[PDB]
Design a protein around this ligand. Structure first.
Ligand SMILES: NC(=O)c1ccc[n+]([C@@H]2O[C@H](COP(=O)([O-])OP(=O)(O)OC[C@H]3O[C@@H](n4cnc5c(N)ncnc54)[C@H](O)[C@@H]3O)[C@@H](O)[C@H]2O)c1
Ligand SMILES: [K+]
Ligand SMILES: [Mg+2]
Ligand SMILES: [Mg+2]
Ligand SMILES: [Mg+2]
Ligand SMILES: [Mg+2]
Ligand SMILES: [Mg+2]
Ligand SMILES: [Mg+2]
Ligand SMILES: [Mg+2]
Lengths: 109, 45, 58, 39, 51, 161
RNA sequence: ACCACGAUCAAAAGGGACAAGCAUCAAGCACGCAGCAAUGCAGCUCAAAACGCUUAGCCUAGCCACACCCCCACGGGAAACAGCAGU
C-alpha cells in the first residue's frame, strides 16, 4: 500500500559504482531445482539510489523500495551498508574485525 | 579451384560485413557513414 | 518460506550470527556461536515463527 | 556428472523424432507413374 | 516481548563469550611466554655465532 | 631504488660492535660483495619497516604481498636482460596473478592495510574483466564503428536541440 | 449503497512472475544514470545465455489471441459462414 515496487527489502553486494548517485547491486536468492531438489543461487541486478556516493564495489548493502521508481531501472534506495568492504564491524561484539580475527579485542573495553 | 571458391567466399564475407555496418548507421539515422569512416578489408591479407 | 530472501556469508566476522530484516525496518540479531543447529532452529521459531495456533487457523 | 553440472546443463533434451516416408501420417494418396520389379 | 527476550539471550551469550575470551587470553599469555623464552635463547645463540 | 652497496647484510646489521671494524671487514660484510638475494632481503626488510605494523610478523598477508612483490621485481629485472627466458616469464606471470589474489583477499578483509600496501609498493589494484572473449578483427572494427556512430548521433541531436 | 461513507467487479498505467529447440545465433549497438531545467557523466544488457533464428494457442470450473487481408484500419485491396444448417 506504501509502494508500487515488488521487492520491498533486499540485501545485496555492490558490483558497480560508475553511475552518478546510483549503485548497481547484485542480489542472490535461493531457488529450488525441480529435478535435483537442491537450492541454487539465482542472481538479479538492482539499481539503488545512493545520494551521498558512499558505496564501494564489494560491500554488502540493504536496499529499501522507493514509493515510486525515480527512473527506468532505479526502484530502490540504499537503506544502509551492512558490511563495508574490508571495514567490517562485528555486529555481535561491536568491534572491528579483519575476516575471522578481531582487530580490537572485545576484552579491550 | 578451391582457391577461387575460397576467395569468392571471402569477398562475400567482406560484403556481408560492410552491409551490416551500413545497416547500423542507416538505422541510427545517419544518411552516410560516420565522417571519415572507411570500412577496412579484414578478410584479405 | 519461499518469498523470504535468504543469503549466506562466509568468514566475514569472527563469530557466526543471524540477522533478520523486517518490513517495518526493524532488525533482529541472533547470536548462534556455541549453539547447536537444533537450538538455532528452536530459537528462530520462538522469536519470529508463527505459532501452531496461527497455522491451525490458516 | 556433479550436481552443479547437471543443474547447469538442465534436463535431458531428447532430439525431435524423425518423420518417416509418410511424414507422420497414417496413409497417403498417390498416382502410379511406372511399374517394375526389384531384386 | 519476544524481541526483548532475544536481546536478553544475546547479552547472556556475550557474558559467556567474555569469560571464554579471558580464559583463552590467560592461557595464550603463558604459551607466548614459553615460546618467547625459546625465541630469546635462539636469538642469543645466533647472535653469538655471528659475532 | 636499490639499497646502496655499502649497506651491511641483514645477518650482520645488529652484531654488537659492527661499527668498530675495519673498512675491509665492512666491505666483506656489505651488499657489494654478495649476490642479489641478500639485496632482495634488504629490500623486503625496508618495505616491511615502512609498511606493516609488526615488521617481525612474516606470517601476515601484507608480509606475503611484500615478499612476492620483491620477487616480482626480481623477475622483471631478470627478464629485462633475458628476453627469451620462457620459464621466468611464466614465473613472473604466476607471481603477478598470486599477488592479485592476495590483494583481493586483503581488500576484502582489511581495507586500511590494503591502502597502505597499495601506496607503499606502488601497486595499482585493478578489477578483473567481467567477460573473457576474443577481440577478433570483425568485433574490433564493429565496436569502433558503433562508438563513432553514437558520437555523430549525439552531435546531430545536440544540433537538433 | 444509489445523501456519500464504502463494498463488489475491473480497464489503462507502475513493479514482479511467466513455453520449447538451436551458442555452428556470442556479442547487442545507445540498448543508462544524475539534474527544476540548461545540461553533465559514459554508461546499460550479456556464456547464471543478452541479441537473434525456428516451433507451438496456454498453466483448461477456464483463459489468451483473431474476427477476409495490409500487426493496426483514417485509408487501400476488395466484397468476406473461423454463427447454425449446407456446398
Ligand atoms: N564466458 C565468460 O566470459 C565467463 C565469465 C565468468 C565466468 N564464466 C564461467 O566459466 C564457466 C564456463 O562458461 P561457458 O561454458 O559458457 O564458456 P565456454 O567454454 O563455452 O566458451 C565461451 C566463452 O566463455 C569463455 N570461457 C570459457 N571458460 C571460461 C572460464 N572458466 N572463465 C571465464 N571465461 C570462460 C571463453 O573464453 C569463451 O569466450 C562457467 O561456469 C561460467 O560461469 C564464464
Ligand atoms: K490481424
Ligand atoms: Mg492492466
Ligand atoms: Mg553450420
Ligand atoms: Mg559453452
Ligand atoms: Mg500456430
Ligand atoms: Mg484486422
Ligand atoms: Mg458452417
Ligand atoms: Mg472465411
Amino acid at each position: 500500500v506504501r509502494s508500487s515496487v515488488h521487492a520491498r527489502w533486499i540485501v545485496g553486494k555492490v558490483i558497480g559504482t560508475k553511475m552518478q548517485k546510483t549503485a548497481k547491486v547484485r542480489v542472490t536468492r535461493l531457488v529450488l531445482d525441480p529435478y535435483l531438489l537442491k537450492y541454487f543461487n539465482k542472481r538479479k541486478t538492482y539499481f539503488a539510489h545512493d545520494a551521498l556516493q558512499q558505496c564501494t564495489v564489494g560491500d554488502i548493502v540493504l536496499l529499501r523500495a522507493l514509493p515510486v521508481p525515480r527512473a527506468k531501472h532505479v526502484k530502490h534506495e540504499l537503506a544502509e551498508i551492512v558490511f563495508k568492504v574490508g571495514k567490517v564491524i562485528d555486529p555481535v561484539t561491536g568491534k572491528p574485525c579483519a575476516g575471522t580475527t578481531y582487530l580490537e579485542s572485545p576484552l579491550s573495553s | 579451384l578451391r582457391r577461387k571458391v575460397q576467395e569468392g567466399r571471402l569477398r562475400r564475407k567482406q560484403i556481408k560485413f560492410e552491409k551490416d555496418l551500413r545497416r547500423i548507421w542507416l538505422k541510427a539515422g545517419l544518411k552516410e557513414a560516420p565522417e571519415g569512416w572507411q570500412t577496412p578489408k579484414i578478410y584479405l591479407r | 518460506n519461499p518469498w523470504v530472501q535468504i543469503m549466506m556469508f562466509k568468514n566475514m566476522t569472527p563469530s557466526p550470527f543471524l540477522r533478520f530484516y523486517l518490513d517495518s525496518g526493524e532488525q533482529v540479531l541472533v547470536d548462534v556461536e556455541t549453539k547447536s543447529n537444533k537450538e538455532i532452529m528452536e530459537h528462530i521459531r520462538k522469536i519470529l515463527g508463527k505459532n501452531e495456533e496461527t497455522l491451525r487457523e490458516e | 556428472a556433479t550436481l552443479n553440472q547437471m543443474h547447469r546443463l538442465g534436463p535431458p533434451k531428447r532430439p525431435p523424432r524423425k518423420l518417416g516416408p509418410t511424414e507422420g501420417r497414417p496413409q497417403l494418396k498417390g498416382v502410379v507413374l511406372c511399374t517394375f520389379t526389384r531384386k | 516481548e519476544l524481541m526483548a527476550w532475544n536481546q536478553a539471550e544475546n547479552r547472556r551469550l556475550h557474558e559467556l563469550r567474555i569469560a571464554r575470551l579471558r580464559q583463552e587470553e590467560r592461557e595464550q599469555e603463558q604459551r607466548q611466554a614459553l615460546e618467547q623464552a625459546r625465541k630469546a635463547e635462539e636469538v642469543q645463540a645466533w647472535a653469538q655465532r655471528k659475532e | 631504488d636499490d639499497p646502496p652497496p655499502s649497506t651491511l647484510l641483514k645477518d650482520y646489521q645488529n652484531v654488537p660492535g659492527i661499527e668498530k671494524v675495519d673498512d675491509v671487514v665492512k666491505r666483506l660484510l656489505s651488499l657489494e660483495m654478495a649476490n642479489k638475494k641478500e639485496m632482495l632481503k634488504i629490500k623486503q626488510e625496508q618495505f616491511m619497516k615502512k609498511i606493516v605494523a609488526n615488521p617481525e610478523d612474516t606470517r601476515s598477508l601484507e608480509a606475503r604481498i611484500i615478499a612476492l612483490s620483491v620477487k616480482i621485481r626480481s623477475y622483471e629485472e631478470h627478464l629485462e636482460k633475458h628476453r627469451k627466458d620462457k620459464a621466468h616469464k611464466r614465473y613472473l606471470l604466476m607471481s603477478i596473478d598470486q599477488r592479485k589474489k592476495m590483494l583481493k583477499n586483503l581488500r576484502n578483509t582489511n581495507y586500511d592495510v590494503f591502502e597502505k600496501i597499495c601506496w607503499g609498493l606502488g601497486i595499482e589494484y585493478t578489477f578483473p574483466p567481467l567477460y573473457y572473449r576474443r577481440a577478433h578483427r570483425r568485433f574490433v572494427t564493429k565496436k569502433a564503428l558503433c562508438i563513432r556512430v553514437f558520437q555523430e548521433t549525439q552531435k546531430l541531436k545536440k544540433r537538433r536541440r
